[PDB]
UniProtKB/TrEMBL annotation, chain A:
<comment type="subunit">
    <text>Component of the 66S pre-ribosomal particle.</text>
</comment>
<comment type="similarity">
    <text>Belongs to the LOC1 family.</text>
</comment>
<feature type="compositionally biased region" description="Basic and acidic residues">
    <location>
        <begin position="74"/>
        <end position="88"/>
    </location>
</feature>
<protein>
    <submittedName>
        <fullName>60S ribosomal subunit-like protein</fullName>
    </submittedName>
</protein>
<comment type="function">
    <text>Required for efficient assembly and nuclear export of the 60S ribosomal subunit.</text>
</comment>
Automatic annotation (TrEMBL), chain B:
<comment type="subunit">
    <text>Component of the pre-66S ribosomal particle.</text>
</comment>
<comment type="function">
    <text>Involved in the biogenesis of the 60S ribosomal subunit. May play a part in the quality control of pre-60S particles.</text>
</comment>
<protein>
    <recommendedName>
        <fullName>Ribosome biogenesis protein NSA2 homolog</fullName>
    </recommendedName>
</protein>
<comment type="similarity">
    <text>Belongs to the eukaryotic ribosomal protein eS8 family. Ribosome biogenesis protein NSA2 subfamily.</text>
</comment>
TrEMBL record, chain D:
<protein>
    <recommendedName>
        <fullName>rRNA processing protein</fullName>
    </recommendedName>
</protein>
<comment type="similarity">
    <text>Belongs to the EBP2 family.</text>
</comment>
<feature type="compositionally biased region" description="Basic and acidic residues">
    <location>
        <begin position="21"/>
        <end position="31"/>
    </location>
</feature>
From TrEMBL, chain E:
<feature type="domain" description="Large ribosomal subunit protein uL30-like ferredoxin-like fold">
    <location>
        <begin position="1"/>
        <end position="40"/>
    </location>
</feature>
<comment type="similarity">
    <text>Belongs to the universal ribosomal protein uL30 family.</text>
</comment>
<protein>
    <submittedName>
        <fullName>60S ribosomal protein l7-like protein</fullName>
    </submittedName>
</protein>
Length: 88, 104, 126, 66, 50
RNA sequence: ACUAACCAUCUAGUAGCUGGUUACCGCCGAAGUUUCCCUCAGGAUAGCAGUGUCGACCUUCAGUUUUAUGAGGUAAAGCGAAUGAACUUUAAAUAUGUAAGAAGCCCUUGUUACUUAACUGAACGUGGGUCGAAUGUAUCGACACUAGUGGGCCAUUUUUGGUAAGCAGAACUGGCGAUGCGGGAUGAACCGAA
RNA sequence: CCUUUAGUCCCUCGAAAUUUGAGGCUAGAGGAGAAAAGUUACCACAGGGAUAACUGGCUUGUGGCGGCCAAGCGUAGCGACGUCGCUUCGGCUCUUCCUAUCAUACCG
């Protein structure tokens, strides 16, 4: 058993998009996360994974919904940052 | 040295018995031909194993740092020396003591 | 130094340069070359296992490789061998072209006048 | 597999070389200590306490400053 | 016996013990006998011996 | 919704493992190893032994000496030679690599697409001159095919390192492994001798 | 850019007065690149290599280290006796042997 990271295994296009890939052995630019909104999105996923299985259908929906609102706020915040930087 | 200390997990498996511990040594001054029992301050280098230096193992040819305040050596600046190197010149495992010669 | 293929060479192994250091067994050996490169030179050295020779192909550099004079006597012998053979035919006297291995010495007399022997002792007391 | 095969048959020779190297390191360490002994006896120039740096740079510095 | 003296005895036709040969003295032959000394006894024969 | 026992047969189930494997005499007779591939107890090649064919007829070869020349200038003598292991006229002991013919060396001028300022060099050709140390030789080489082998133990000498002393590792050679006999009162490692 | 080394006591800054510290100068040493890389007589796990394991004229009553002295060896180094300096276990047993003898015998 050996890690796929250790082997130089090409990345494959699937239902999950590969996106823009980065060359190996080069500067993969650090994308810092420091906003409260960006931290909230990551935190919601972590909490959802730890909680795991919930028997209630409504309680399961609410856990998914709070991640959706966290994503929406982060996207709105980053959009406003782009507009301010582009305009001013 | 210290009565109680917490060791790194590297060395938390090497146990050193109480009976094998020494705190003083018979240190000889070559110039002022005399020897005085002087306390040991630190082990600087054991020229047999770097691990032994970390563990403080006293073997033959080991450099230790001793408190020479009682002798009263006057330095070139006029101060009184408080610590000097000393090389163990015996086998403390076979002879139940530590003998050293001051590096002066 | 310009060295060609097929020339017999000698290996000296100097400690000035640590690059291309051969083993102590290969130090001070004589062999022929089989390939020449910019810096390294390949030689063939055949060494006995117990009876058979196995040809080691090792690489050595210019600072250790020097030519040899092993054959130079053989070319020297044939040139005079040609010269005296033609020379012998001219005058008409036989000449001997093989080399004889140091025959023992013949008889002679040694005089004592003005060379009186000096008596010696097992340990010199002077 | 190839790397283990070299470790297969070179294993004992590396053992003896390591023992020879460790003995050599013992000789050099004792030589440097003995060299310091001669220098102090001949002359030297110190402070109240010995140098705080480890006992390889301190010896190298002292033998260099002469 | 080391390999070097073994070859000399073969070259001198001294294959068995108490084998004798006639050799003419020569620096080529003198050095050969000097190597097989721990196995041979040699000297100068007279007319009766021959 | 899902997923015990005995009898006969498939079955003489699957082993790399254990034990065993059947007259005599003669002849020839080993290896315990280099190298390469591969991790699954292994294969290939070469070496040793043998058979067949072909080519040469001691033709030719050789764990040897001599000669010439390297790496060892290591000892020694002197400094009424100079200079000062690191000095030298000379030079030890000691092993040790290479070479010693017509399967050879040089010269020569014809060509060449190579090369040169050039018929100039190099290659391809022509001709010229006691066969060029000793000793031994119970033959040498080439090709194809076939079987058993892939360990090591001890000792001398040299050498690397270490211990209070032990000791550990390399190189050569020798003894034992496939060996009987004489001696050491006896006997894997000793001496003599097969 | 700082730190070390030697130098002219060559310039500046700070301090105290009857001297210093820090910079500056001369030339030696340390510090393709945010992807990862190197390194350890260390630890944990997995695996590999050398190895069945030790002692057999073994053991016993007088310490080690440093100096002084020291016949020699030798032509500086090794150097004893002394002196100075610093201090698994317990119980059970029978027969015989040993002496390194507790007692009984005899001696100084």
């Amino acid at each position: 058993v050996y890690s796929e990271k250790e082997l130089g295994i090409p990345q494959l296009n699937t239902v999950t998009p590969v996106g823009v890939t980065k060359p190996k052995g080069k500067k993969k630019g650090k994308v810092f996360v420091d906003d409260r909104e960006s931290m909230n999105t990551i935190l919601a996923m972590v909490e959802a994974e730890k909680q795991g299985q919930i028997e209630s259908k409504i309680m399961r929906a609410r856990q998914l919904e709070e991640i959706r609102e966290a994503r929406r706020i982060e996207a709105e915040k980053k959009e406003a940052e782009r507009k301010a930087l582009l305009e001013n | 040295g210290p009565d109680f200390t917490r060791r790194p997990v590297k060395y938390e498996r090497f146990i050193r018995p109480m009976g094998l511990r020494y705190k003083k040594a018979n240190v000889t001054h070559p110039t002022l031909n005399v020897t005085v029992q002087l306390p040991i301050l630190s082990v600087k280098k054991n020229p047999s194993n770097p691990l032994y230096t970390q563990l403080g193992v006293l073997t033959k040819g080991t450099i230790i740092e001793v408190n020479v305040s009682d002798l009263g050596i006057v330095t070139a600046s006029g101060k009184i020396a408080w610590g000097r190197y000393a090389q163990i010149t015996n086998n403390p495992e076979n002879d139940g003591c530590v003998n050293a010669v001051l590096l002066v | 130094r310009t060295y060609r293929v097929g020339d017999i060479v000698d290996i000296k192994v100097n400690g000035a340069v640590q690059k291309g250091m051969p083993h102590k067994f290969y130090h001070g050996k004589t062999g022929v070359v089989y390939n020449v490169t910019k810096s390294a030179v390949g030689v063939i050295v055949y060494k006995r296992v117990k009876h058979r020779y196995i040809e080691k192909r090792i690489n050595v550099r210019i600072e250790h490789v020097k030519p040899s004079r092993s054959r130079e006597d053989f070319l020297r012998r044939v040139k005079e061998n040609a010269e005296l053979k033609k020379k012998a035919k001219a005058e008409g006297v036989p000449v001997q072209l093989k080399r004889q291995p140091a025959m023992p010495r013949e008889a002679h007399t040694v005089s004592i006048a003005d060379n009186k022997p000096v008596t010696l002792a097992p340990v010199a007391y002077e | 597999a190839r790397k283990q095969r070299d470790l297969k048959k070179f294993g004992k020779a590396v053992q003896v070389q390591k023992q020879l190297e460790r003995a050599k390191q013992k000789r050099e360490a004792l030589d440097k200590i003995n060299q310091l002994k001669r220098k102090r006896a001949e002359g030297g120039a110190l402070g109240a306490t010995e140098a705080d740096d480890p006992f390889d740079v301190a010896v190298d510095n002292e033998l260099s400053r002469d | 016996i080391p390999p070097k003296p073994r070859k000399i005895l073969q070259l001198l036709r001294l294959r068995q013990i108490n084998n004798g040969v006639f050799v003419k003295v020569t620096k080529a032959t003198a050095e050969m006998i000097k190597i097989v000394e721990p196995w041979v006894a040699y000297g100068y024969p007279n007319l009766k011996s021959v």
